[PDB]
Design goal:
- Chain C: This is Putative U3 small nucleolar ribonucleoprotein protein.
- Chain C: It is found in: Nucleus, Nucleolus.
- Chain C: It comes from Chaetomium thermophilum (strain DSM 1495 / CBS 144.50 / IMI 039719) (Thermochaetoides thermophila).
- This is part of a larger assembly, with chains A, B, C, D and E.
- By secondary structure, chain B is of the alpha+beta class.
- Chain B contains 2 helices and 3 strands, in the order αβββα.
- By secondary structure, chain C is mainly alpha-helical.
- Chain C is 28% helix and 7% strand.
- In chain C, a hairpin with a 5-residue loop joins strand 1 and strand 2.
- In chain E, strands 1-56-55-54 form a 4-stranded antiparallel sheet, with no helix packed on it. In chain E, strands 2-3-4-5 form a 4-stranded antiparallel sheet, with no helix packed on it.
- The relative contact order of chain E is 0.06.
- Chain E is of the alpha+beta class.
- Classes of the chains: A mainly beta, B alpha+beta, C mainly alpha, D alpha+beta, E alpha+beta.
- Chains in contact: A-B, A-C, A-D, A-E, B-D, C-E, D-E.
- The interface between A and E is large, with 115 and 119 residues.
Chain lengths: 839, 58, 89, 126, 902
């Protein structure tokens, strides 16, 4: 296949440290995830990720109120602004200090940033999308004013509605009223009187009454009335009241001014929202047990967005109907493994948190969570039928769920209690094999009887990787006694051919055409064996090819460090020629299985907040007392719930304390897609789903000198030779041109062009018509095309079956979309109409 | 000695199972005591092999 | 070593799988997905001896057979099958 | 300072120490030369790795082998395993990793027993 | 102007021109050194090393010719209108223009220097002096020196002010005269004569730290220092050669540094534009000399191509730091130590660039997906025989690749004092470079110090070997370079034929380096061990395929299967790698003589530049030409690709850049350059283009207007059942909206209070959702039914939100009972019309399903709409028979073809 894998979207995590946003239309939700910014489109279920990549985690996100410009600032003040309708990075910039507040003016010309003590208001830069004759200048941001008249952290900044005044809410118990330019009857005034520091300072609609909301759970309304001794008036405090959340301090508040309502999110996870000017409690509820990090109201005012930091826990809540709009939960531990569904539309992850969850590929949302496990869940796997999912976890139970009723119809457990860490299933969906660390046997249950079938044995060590053969006849185990075992079970003689290696086995995988096996050992090398004559046919030592390291707390060079120099998990591509390998390191490698060269390397995370994401640290970060990312910085915290250190000493695998400062990066799981064209990797940053780039790259197949888009459209419109025009379009491989031609030819010469089509271009045509079925609104046309293709080249595909399996699978999934989406509807409609006509 | 062991596993010579361990606080249970070994390309492993005169440079 | 297993029961309702899912605006299941009632027909009804009528008996296949309409040889063979089962246990 | 690589070869009870040093090209076994040490019909099994990898690869090395234990066939297999593993480890340690990979590729394409000794365990059909 | 590339920045350029920099002290800790690019100003900070702080924008239309830096603003005068160009004086602040100055109309002279003091600013142009009131930025008057001789009226040197002298500038003239002018009344108050009148012209003049002692350096040679109100010479030094006139002097104002002990003050540094060495005088006893810093920059010579000369020296105030700016694109600062008596200083900061125009460019390949990407590191090989890694992100991390201790080697030799020069001691000038960071081990590439170009392997394989290979001008060796260490590699490959190298390439694997001489041989070397592996041809007829002439442009496929080579004259040969044998030769012998090649991986495309002034793109897989381009009028200087593969860019000798769109085989861009471009390089992501001009030292960077905004340019120049566009999720949640709201209800209800606030405030666009489109739906349907087109109604039902759609479908009714009022009958007729038209099949199905699901009572009770239901049943039956036959046949055939073996 074409190894041109750009970075498509992040997935599997929904919210992280950072601040939410709503698009000014009110549909799109901008949420930070690690060091990228994910758009959730809600009016249609979709999601994507902007192509920029920060160096540290996202701290603040602002958006130009027109809607086009987004500006994201990480920690340490590195900032990137991008254009959202054409998703391209535009400008980089460095606020010198950590940014702690950010707000764009509703007039759109200005934006204010609150650094630690400072407040700087800047001009919004002109963009090439906005000006007609303009390109990128060198220094786009123009600083308009500085203000250092504060005394502590500036935590909030809010504009007015006419964009002439703004408010700054500090940590030294003060709000301040600033103006843009010098007004006539204005002074840059202060507002004090509080007990534990202001969280927010908002304006009313008619900008005469303002509100301050303070961390002790208090809210004060200020107005401009005269001093109580009567030119001489003063911004004084007309009334006060308190939220009575008992043992809790409110973290984050927001105020919709057009409707005059205020939402507040506390530390015991119970938020509450209040109709403000008379302070009537509208309602209140508990979204989460931990804390509520950020609230943001819709522009219209009917939707609220809450983000909780310690877990994923993003939720948009629709307050006048008392119901969620979405409540998504990103993993709070390391994702141990994943698999795709054989349809390819949705993927499923098992994490060391205990919960497994099925996410959808489009729309980025977890669509179901299974939580029947009482500890961390190791490997999960599907059958060929794609409706039954088998999970194996550390609680000593291999569970077997159904995906059309969502109930674990089987639970398997060995009689002596083990802790299953690797598993596999016969592709017929009938036999489940599993193995642990605590016992060097390998158990086999059947799924239709429910009892243990047998305990295979012969291993002088714990089994560490398992694989069933995709034809459904061979088991393969790989175990720390430096051995692999070709188990033959289903025949009348259960035999076990040994394969001697040099070191421990860490991963086993099968080629789709089941004749080849690849095993990844502890040296860091891949050995490719042939399953018929059990002889090694290839081998690649990729220790140097994967070594990327120097985690903090490591006194070896990244060159000499051992433990990051192997391949944890390998998988074959759906073509059968590209192996993908990933270990405990920054790099994911992609080899070929015939030429055995490194086709392409990828870096999983440029995020500097994780541990091992650059292979050379610097003496600036090393102080005299060890590394500066190692000093226990918990003590300078204001919340006791964040000050307590309930960590357990020496707990590499997950503990409920989970200090988790600078987590390690590890590519814990990888998997291709059954649709081809994409793969993904569960890493500690999240779940990266890479795809191909076929729209941004011109890649012809076998071009001549005299084939242009102009010449293709000319032989379409002028001479009208549809076959020749279509072959020229596929030869150019420009998707817009191919769509133009294929939509232009009529639906009666389809049999003609398909009969005279070339077999070399058949499979790419099948892939194209399947994608056109899944995307285009010309469904009867596309189905006519597929029927003509299969009725003409029937015996060719059936004779091949190995070169065209992914093409047939994607055609099947598009046709099943059509069938189970519309024809069931038509049948139910016509039967209901028949009964209603027959009374 | 215990000081020598702490110096070693801080230098990162000692895996248990398949993953190296750099924290000297890892609590080895009675099933992992049979698996705490040296790491793959360790100079310590080379020195042990050179003492027993079985140093396999392949 | 994880734990000894202990019997834990979980009750399921008749609500659809689209009530089992997590909170999101539109479901990932299609139009066929959404009518699957999260419990099988075997559980919404199963003919058994504890739910038969008075005179009739239900057979192994799930077909109601009346004690009046059965001939004598059918009664004898059914008594023999019951005796064989009881001897097996 | 001087480049040297020691490697071990195994058979049933035949072990083979092979120490490879940069030299004029000679190969000795128990002092006696390679064309002499064997029964006169297993010398081809001795020359198999040199004949696979070509003589230009062994043009720069000098291999001295000691062997003891096991019978005639066992010692011959031990020496050929020591030869193959010696030249592969020397090319791993003192010339380019690509050349090491090409050598190991040719040797594995011939026969895996040239590199990894597969002992005969007892596991008959249980 | 261009339709694709807009100029972004002239990177690689810190001080190229004859105009001096100027410094300003910020605070008590930092200094801004602001120097001239040529079209803008660069301000560097001193406390933070010498990182860049500001680059001025917008670019002034002429060359900048005088700078000064007052409190926070920087004043820049530009434009010599004696030849064509426009002129002006601009006021920048933080790098943005904030003011312009009103120039006099009758000013036809370039502006030499600017001087700000008091409340005035003063521009000494050439023979006349303009003055401005700075508090209001307005003109004041014009000072006109008069003379008896036309030459002697010219104002060389300049005008400096003394510290305590109120409103009095000191101008120097072309004769040895120095005139003191009161600027306020515009009145000449004094003139002072040079001693020993054989000395001709005041070359420079500078106030001393002593009060009212001026230092005048004459072009006849003498340095004088004089009381400017006693007109008595304090000191007179024969400190200038008649051919080497002193051009700049500066006094150390700290308070020590002389007396042969470091305890006494009075040190003066001086610099002559024809030398590269500066001189330090200790002025205690009689004004003795105390040292010379030899070769502060490149020594200017008239024969060499490397520029040289010292522009300015300024001792920084109250500090031992001396900052010097060369004409050779360099800015260095030196410092005097205290505890050992250092007569001549040591170096503590240096920014530098190329001292000659740039010859070849190469963006470093992408750190696979890392933060560097393909648009951070540029590699420029320059005619001063140097190799720099410029950095597009921060201008302070741009480093010269070291070729060994070259300056130490020269100073242990004698190249600094008076034989060859330092450029001659470096490597030869670079012609081509080829790199791959597939094995660049970063900072610890090979631990320890390594020998350089000599002409152990486990450590190399553990960390990483060389990464850049470089073919020089006429040397029989091609050099290697580490990249992670920014130092020269340990290997220098011969070619085999002894002929000079012509083109070099390197594998994508980072292992093999292929050199190709101008004789024909193509040798291949493993880089890690530096060893000869393969020769082409090894030793069609096997062993006979050798090129007859020079070899230009070899490049290796990333699969390590084929190397493709292009001869100078004749042929293009595909060679099989591992056996090393010829495989396929395509001959363009009698009609062309190929001058270059470039490669596109990920597209497998090659582009040959042919010296009949044409470009041929050929596919490496099918082995036949696919595109040709005929645009040039001169020799193709440099050409490259885009990583998209959509553009191929060519800059010829005709000073014109052409950009061809490759798939439609057309031109898109054709723009003229002010100077002919020498080398071109596109970045490995599509943002930056890098052009090295001719004559200009330091390269130009263009952005990508197309990657930002869509451009309309395509101007070739010369000089059936259908679905809908409605969201699937939308009509599906309309179908299922009871249970979706059931699950979106929370588990526990919210704790609403007992005193529940009745009348929650109005939210959304007037009481309803903000997502219903703003302008009666029954009125729409009924008026359409009075008419015949329900299409307005169906479009409205499409654009409704799902909850509102279910509501406006539940709120239909029978009404009065007449045939033209019942919403149900008209709704069924609308669905029937859409079904006949075959437009929104899935939508009509979903609406009919929900309609029968919640309206079956009325439709089972009545019959006036059961007739329309009968018509609907007919149409639905025909359409469902056709579509179900189609879908079922396709699904069954696909299932059988996937699994036919049972």
């Amino acid at each position: 296949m074409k190894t041109n894998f750009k970075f498509s979207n992040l997935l599997g995590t929904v919210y992280c440290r950072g601040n939410l946003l709503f698009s000014p239309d009110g549909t799109h939700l901008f949420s930070p995830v690690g060091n990228r910014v994910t758009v959730f489109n809600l009016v249609e279920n979709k999601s994507y990720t902007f192509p920029f990549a920060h160096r540290k985690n996202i701290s603040r996100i602002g958006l130009t109120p027109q809607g086009n410009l987004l500006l994201s600032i990480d920690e340490d003040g590195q900032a990137i602004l991008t254009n959202v309708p054409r998703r391209v990075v535009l400008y980089h910039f460095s606020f010198k200090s950590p940014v702690t507040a950010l707000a764009f003016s509703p007039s759109g010309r200005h934006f204010v940033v609150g650094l630690k003590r400072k407040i700087e208001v800047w001009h919004v830069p002109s963009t090439p999308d906005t000006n007609e004759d303009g390109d990128l200048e060198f220094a786009p941001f123009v600083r308009h004013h500085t203000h250092m008249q504060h005394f502590d952290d500036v935590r909030h900044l809010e504009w007015s509605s006419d964009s002439r005044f703004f408010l700054s809410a500090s940590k030294d118990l003060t709000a301040r009223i600033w103006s843009l330019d010098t007004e006539e009857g204005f002074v840059p005034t202060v507002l004090s009187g509080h007990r534990q520091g202001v969280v927010g300072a908002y304006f009313s609609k008619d900008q005469e009454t303002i509100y301050t909301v303070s961390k002790d759970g208090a809210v004060f309304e200020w107005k401009y009335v005269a001093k109580p001794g009567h030119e001489d008036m003063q911004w004084r405090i007309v009334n006060k009241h308190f939220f009575m959340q008992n043992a809790a301090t409110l973290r984050c508040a927001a105020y919709h001014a057009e409707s005059n309502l205020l939402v507040a999110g506390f530390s015991n996870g119970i938020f509450g929202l209040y109709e403000m000017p008379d302070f009537n409690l509208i309602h209140t509820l508990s979204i989460s047990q931990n804390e509520i990090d950020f609230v943001t109201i819709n522009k219209s005012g009917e939707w609220l967005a809450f983000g909780a930091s310690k877990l994923g826990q993003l939720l948009v809540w629709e307050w006048q109907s008392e119901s969620y709009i979405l409540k998504q939960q990103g993993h709070f531990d390391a994702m141990n493994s994943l698999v795709y569904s054989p349809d390819g539309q949705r993927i499923v992850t098992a994490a060391d948190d205990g919960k497994i969850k099925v996410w959808d590929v489009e729309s980025g949302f977890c669509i179901v969570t299974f939580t029947e496990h009482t500890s961390g869940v190791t490997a999960c796997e599907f059958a060929k039928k794609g409706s039954v999912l088998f999970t194996a976890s550390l609680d000593g139970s291999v569970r077997a769920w159904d995906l059309i009723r969502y109930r674990n119809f089987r639970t398997f457990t060995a009689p002596e209690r083990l802790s299953f860490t690797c598993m596999a299933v016969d592709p017929s969906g009938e036999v489940i094999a599993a193995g642990s660390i605590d016992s060097f046997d390998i158990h086999i249950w059947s799924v239709q009887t429910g009892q243990l079938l047998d305990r295979l044995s012969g291993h002088e060590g714990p089994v560490s990787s398992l694989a069933f053969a995709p034809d459904g006849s061979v088991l393969v185990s790989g175990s720390w006694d430096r051995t692999a075992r070709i188990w033959s079970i289903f025949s009348r003689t259960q035999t076990s051919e040994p394969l001697q290696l040099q070191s421990d086995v860490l991963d086993v995988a099968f080629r789709p055409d089941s004749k080849q096996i690849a095993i990844s050992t502890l040296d860091g090398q891949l050995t490719f064996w042939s399953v018929s004559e059990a002889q090694q046919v290839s081998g690649v030592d990729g220790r140097r090819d994967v070594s990327g390291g120097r985690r903090i707390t490591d006194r070896r060079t990244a060159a000499n460090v051992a433990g990051t120099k192997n391949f944890n998990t390998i998988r074959y591509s759906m073509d059968g020629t590209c192996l993908l390998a990933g270990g405990n390191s920054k790099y994911i490698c992609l080899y070929s299985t015939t030429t055995m060269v490194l086709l392409k390397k990828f870096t999983v995370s440029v995020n500097l907040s994780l541990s091992g994401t650059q292979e050379f640290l610097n003496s600036k970060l090393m102080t005299e007392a060890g590394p500066v990312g190692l000093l226990d910085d918990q003590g300078e915290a204001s919340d006791l719930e964040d000050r307590i250190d309930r960590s357990l000493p020496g707990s590499k695998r997950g503990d409920p304390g989970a200090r988790k400062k600078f987590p390690e990066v590890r590519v814990s799981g990888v998997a291709f897609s059954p649709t081809g064209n994409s793969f993904c990797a569960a890493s500690t940053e999240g779940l990266l789903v890479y795809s191909l780039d076929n729209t941004v790259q011109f890649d012809p197949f076998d071009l001549n000198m005299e084939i242009t888009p102009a010449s293709t459209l000319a032989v379409l419109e002028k001479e009208k030779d549809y076959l020749k025009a279509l072959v020229m379009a596929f030869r150019l491989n420009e998707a817009g041109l191919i769509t133009r031609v294929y939509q232009a030819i009529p639906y009666t010469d389809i049999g003609l062009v398909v009969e005279q089509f070339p077999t070399v271009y058949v499979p790419r045509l099948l892939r194209f018509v399947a994608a056109q079925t899944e995307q285009s609104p010309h469904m009867e046309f596309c189905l006519l095309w597929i029927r003509a293709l299969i009725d003409k080249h029937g015996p060719w595909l059936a004779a091949n079956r190995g070169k065209v399996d992914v093409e047939l699978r994607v055609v099947a999934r598009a046709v099943a979309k059509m069938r189970d989406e519309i024809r069931r509807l038509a049948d139910e409609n016509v039967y209901m109409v028949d009964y209603l006509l027959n009374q | 000695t215990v000081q020598a062991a702490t110096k070693l596993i801080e230098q990162g010579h000692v895996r248990v199972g398949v993953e190296e361990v750099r924290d000297p606080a890892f609590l080895v249970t009675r099933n992992m005591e049979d698996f705490v070994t040296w790491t793959v390309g360790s100079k310590i492993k080379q020195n042990i092999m050179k003492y027993r005169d079985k140093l396999d440079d392949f | 070593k994880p734990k000894p297993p202990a019997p834990t029961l979980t009750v399921v309702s008749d609500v659809a799988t689209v009530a089992m899912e997590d909170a999101q605006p539109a479901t990932a299941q299609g139009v066929a997905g959404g009518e699957t009632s999260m419990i099988a027909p075997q559980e919404v009804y199963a003919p058994s001896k504890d739910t038969a009528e008075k005179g009739e008996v239900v057979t192994k296949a799930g077909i109601p057979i009346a004690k009046q309409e059965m001939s004598r040889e059918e009664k004898l063979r059914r008594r023999r099958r019951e005796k064989e089962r009881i001897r097996k246990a | 300072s001087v480049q040297a690589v020691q490697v071990f070869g195994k058979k049933k009870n035949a072990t083979a120490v092979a120490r490879c040093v940069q030299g004029k090209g000679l190969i000795k076994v128990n002092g006696k030369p390679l064309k002499l040490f064997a029964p006169e019909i297993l010398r081809a099994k001795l020359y198999e790795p040199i004949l696979i990898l070509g003589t230009d690869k062994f043009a720069d090395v000098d291999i001295r082998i000691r062997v003891a234990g096991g019978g005639h066939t066992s010692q011959v297999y031990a020496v050929r395993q020591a030869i193959a593993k010696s030249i592969v480890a020397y090319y791993a340690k003192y010339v380019d990793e690509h050349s090491k990979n090409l050598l190991k590729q040719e040797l594995i394409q011939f026969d895996r027993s040239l590199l990894v000794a597969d002992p005969r365990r007892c596991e008959p059909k249980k | 102007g261009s339709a694709i590339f807009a100029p972004y920045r002239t990177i690689g350029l810190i001080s190229p021109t004859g105009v001096p920099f100027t410094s300003i002290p910020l605070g008590k800790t930092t200094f801004q050194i602001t120097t001239s690019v040529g079209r803008a100003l660069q301000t560097y900070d001193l406390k933070r090393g010498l990182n860049l702080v500001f680059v001025t924008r917008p670019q002034t239309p002429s060359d900048i010719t005088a700078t000064h830096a007052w409190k926070e603003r920087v004043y820049a005068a530009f434009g010599d209108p004696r030849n064509g160009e426009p002129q002006g004086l601009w006021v920048f602040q933080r790098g943005k223009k904030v003011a312009e100055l009103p120039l006099p109309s009758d000013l036809d002279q370039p502006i030499k220097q600017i001087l700000i003091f008091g409340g005035w600013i003063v521009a000494c142009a050439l023979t006349r002096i303009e003055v401005w009131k700075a508090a209001t930025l307005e003109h004041y008057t014009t000072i006109f020196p008069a003379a008896s001789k036309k030459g002697d009226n010219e104002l060389t040197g300049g005008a400096i002010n003394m510290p305590t002298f109120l409103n009095k500038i000191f101008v120097g003239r072309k004769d040895g005269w120095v005139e003191i002018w009161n600027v306020s009344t515009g009145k000449l108050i004094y003139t002072l004569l040079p001693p020993s009148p054989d000395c001709g012209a005041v070359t420079c003049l500078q106030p001393t730290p002593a009060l009212s002692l001026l230092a005048i350096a004459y072009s006849g040679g003498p340095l004088v220092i004089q009381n400017v109100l006693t007109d008595k010479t304090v000191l007179l030094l024969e400190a200038g050669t008649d051919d080497a006139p002193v051009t700049s002097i500066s006094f150390r104002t700290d308070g020590l540094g002389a007396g042969q002990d470091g305890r006494k003050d009075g040190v003066m540094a001086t610099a002559t534009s024809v030398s590269g060495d500066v001189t330090f005088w200790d002025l205690n006893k009689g004004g003795r000399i105390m040292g010379v810093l030899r070769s502060a920059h490149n020594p200017p010579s008239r024969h060499n191509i490397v520029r040289g000369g010292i522009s300015k020296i300024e001792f920084l105030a109250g500090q031992p730091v001396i900052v010097t700016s060369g004409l050779d694109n360099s800015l260095k600062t030196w410092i005097f130590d205290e505890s050992p008596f250092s007569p001549v200083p040591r170096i503590l900061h240096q920014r530098s660039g190329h001292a000659a125009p740039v010859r070849c460019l190469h963006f470093l390949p992408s750190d696979f997906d890392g933060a560097e990407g393909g648009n951070k590191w540029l590699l420029s090989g320059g005619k001063d025989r140097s190799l720099w890694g410029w950095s597009l992100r921060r201008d302070g991390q741009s480093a010269e690749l070291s070729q060994g201790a070259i300056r130490k080697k020269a100073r242990k030799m004698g190249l600094l004092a008076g034989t060859t020069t330092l450029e001659d001691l470096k490597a030869p000038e670079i012609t081509c470079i080829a790199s791959s960071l597939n094995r660049d081990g970063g900072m610890g590439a090979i631990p320890g110090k390594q020998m350089i170009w000599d002409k152990n392997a486990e450590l190399s394989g553990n960390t990483g070997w060389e990464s850049v290979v470089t073919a020089h001008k006429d040397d029989p060796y091609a050099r290697t370079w580490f990249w992670g260490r920014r130092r020269a590699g340990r290997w220098a490959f011969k070619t085999g034929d002894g002929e000079p190298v012509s083109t070099v390439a390197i594998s994508s694997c980072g292992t093999f380096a292929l050199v190709g001489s101008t004789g024909g041989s193509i040798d291949m070397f493993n880089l890690q061990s530096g060893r000869h592996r393969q020769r082409f041809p090894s030793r069609f007829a096997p062993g006979t395929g050798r090129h007859t002439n020079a070899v230009t442009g070899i490049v290796v496929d990333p699969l390590n299967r084929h190397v493709v080579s292009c001869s100078l004259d004749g042929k293009v040969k595909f060679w099989d790698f591992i056996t090393g044998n010829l495989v396929d030769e395509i001959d363009w012998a009698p009609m062309t003589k190929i001058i270059g090649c470039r490669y596109h991986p990920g597209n497998d495309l090659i582009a040959f530049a042919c010296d009949d002034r044409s470009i041929r793109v050929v596919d490496i897989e099918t082995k036949n030409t696919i595109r040709e381009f005929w645009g040039c009028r001169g020799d193709i200087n440099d050409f490259c690709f885009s990583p998209d593969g959509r553009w191929i860019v060519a800059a010829s000798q005709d000073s014109i850049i052409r950009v061809w769109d490759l798939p439609t085989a057309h031109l898109i861009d054709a723009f003229r350059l002010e100077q002919p471009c020498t080398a071109l390089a596109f970045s490995h992501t599509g943002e930056y283009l890098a052009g090295a001009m001719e004559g200009s030292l330091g390269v130009q960077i263009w952005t990508n207007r197309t990657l930002f905004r869509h451009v309309p340019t395509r101007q070739i120049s010369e000089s059936m059942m259908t679905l809908s566009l409605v969201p699937r999720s939308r009509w599906q949640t309309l179908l299922h909206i009871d249970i979706i709201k059931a699950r979106n209800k929370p588990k526990e209800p919210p704790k609403a209070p007992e005193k529940a606030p009745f009348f929650l405030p109005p939210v959304g666009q007037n009481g309803i959702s903000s997502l219903i489109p703003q302008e009666t739906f029954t009125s729409k349907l009924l008026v359409g039914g009075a008419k015949g087109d329900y299409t307005d109604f169906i479009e409205h039902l499409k654009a409704l939100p799902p909850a509102a759609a279910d509501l406006e479908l539940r709120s239909l009714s029978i009404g009065n009972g007449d045939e033209a009022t019942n919403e149900l009958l008209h709704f069924i007729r609308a669905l029937t019309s859409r079904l006949v038209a075959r437009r929104d099949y899935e939508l009509t199905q979903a609406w009919m399903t929900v309609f029968l699901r919640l309206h079956f009572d009325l439709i089972m009770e009545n019959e006036e709409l059961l007739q329309a239901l009968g018509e609907w049943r007919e149409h639905q039956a025909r359409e469902r028979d056709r579509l179900s036959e189609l879908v079922g046949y396709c699904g069954g055939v696909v299932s059988f073809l996937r699994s036919p073996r049972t």
